[PDB]
Each structure stands twice: as C-alpha cells, then as structure tokens.
Amino acid sequence: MNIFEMLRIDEGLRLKIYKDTEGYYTIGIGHLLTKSPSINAAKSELDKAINAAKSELDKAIGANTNGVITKDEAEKLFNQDVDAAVRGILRNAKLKPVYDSLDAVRRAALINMVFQMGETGVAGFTNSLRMLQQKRWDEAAVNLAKSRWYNQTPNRAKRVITTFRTGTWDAYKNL
Ligand SMILES: [Cl-]
C-alpha cells in the first residue's frame, strides 16, 4: 500500500465527467473540474455549467475530450494531483510541521485529506492537527469525526481516521 493505491481506492476511477457529493463535476481519480448549479438551475444554466467543466478538462488534458478520458489520461491527472497535494502541504505553515512530525503511513493519511479537501481546508482543522503533532492518536480520531467531512463521506473518513489512529494500512486491506 502507498498513497497512490490508497487514493485510487478512495476516489475510484471514472472515465466520464460525474458530480460528486459536494456538487463538483469530477473525472478520473478524483480530479475536480468545476461546481455544478442547482438541480433546478435553468436549462441554460445546466448546459453552461457542463460546458464549463468540459472546458476545464480540455485545458487540463490539452485536447478536445468532450468529457471523456482514457485510463492513461486519468492516471496522468492523478500523478499531477498527488504531486500538488504534497507540494501544498510543504508550502503551508500549518500543515508542514504536522507532516514532518508524522511517520510514512500517517503522512499518507494527511495527503489523502489534502487531496480531497484542499490545502486551505485541511489547514483549518487546527485542533486535530495539534493532536496529531502531539501523537494523541485516539483524541485526534475522535476530533476528526466531528466534522462535515466525516458526516458527508463517513466510510472514507473512517478509513483515513483509522489510518491516523493505528499508523497501519489495516483499513485498506482487503479492498
Ligand atoms: Cl489540471
């Protein structure tokens, strides 16, 4: 197990644009494109939003994709996105010290969160980050679950939280 295999499990692999639970058009292995309008937002609004997502994808791939990519392309955006998550952690004054204090497995769990919620979002978990830095694993686990993140994607958050709790890959074994 490693950060790529871990995120591939949590994000899945879809070759056509889809909408995630937060309302973001997404594709590949968790590659976020743009926000979608209301399930009502006018007939025009919808087409606009979809074309805006297709435009973002074309820009990312460097080709006219029409909202569909190959597995190889999804893996390329994934390599870029994992790289970006790590880079985000290292340039952030709040996340870097926590990342540096963690072991490899727990580092992967932090990259997983940043990949899902972005640098700024994770850097805002001030109390959980402090508990992680203090190696108070069970306390950090309890605190991390008190979040919209956990409530919206509980099965995934539980695996990430268990990874911070144990410092092992047990939550991803047999998946
Ligand atoms: Cl991109």
Side-chain angles (χ1 to χ4, degrees), residues 54-175:
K54 286 181 172 183
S55 186
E56 288 300 293
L57 178 62
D58 286 354
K59 167 160 69 74
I61 294 294
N64 189 327
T65 70
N66 196 34
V68 181
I69 54 172
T70 66
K71 177 177 181 177
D72 278 5
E73 291 169 339
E75 291 177 342
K76 181 164 178 69
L77 300 175
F78 183 40
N79 283 324
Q80 291 176 171
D81 293 344
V82 174
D83 195 5
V86 176
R87 291 183 313 186
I89 283 170
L90 295 175
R91 76 187 204 199
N92 184 283
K94 293 177 171 185
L95 299 169
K96 184 181 173 182
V98 177
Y99 185 81
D100 291 338
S101 80
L102 301 168
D103 54 275
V105 177
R106 290 189 172 93
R107 278 180 180 165
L110 188 67
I111 294 164
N112 190 307
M113 289 184 75
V114 171
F115 187 99
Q116 180 179 7
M117 291 175 280
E119 180 195 329
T120 294
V122 182
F125 278 62
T126 308
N127 302 317
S128 284
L129 291 170
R130 177 184 72 245
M131 294 170 196
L132 290 175
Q133 175 128 28
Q134 287 173 162
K135 311 194 176 294
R136 290 175 180 249
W137 313 129
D138 289 331
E139 290 184 58
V142 171
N143 187 263
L144 288 162
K146 292 178 149 72
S147 61
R148 179 167 197 276
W149 168 61
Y150 182 92
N151 283 100
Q152 284 295 104
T153 52
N155 289 336
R156 177 189 183 156
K158 286 176 43 56
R159 293 190 288 275
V160 172
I161 291 175
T162 291
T163 303
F164 282 126
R165 270 191 76 184
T166 67
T168 70
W169 296 113
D170 185 290
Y172 291 86
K173 302 301 194 184
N174 316 310
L175 274 184

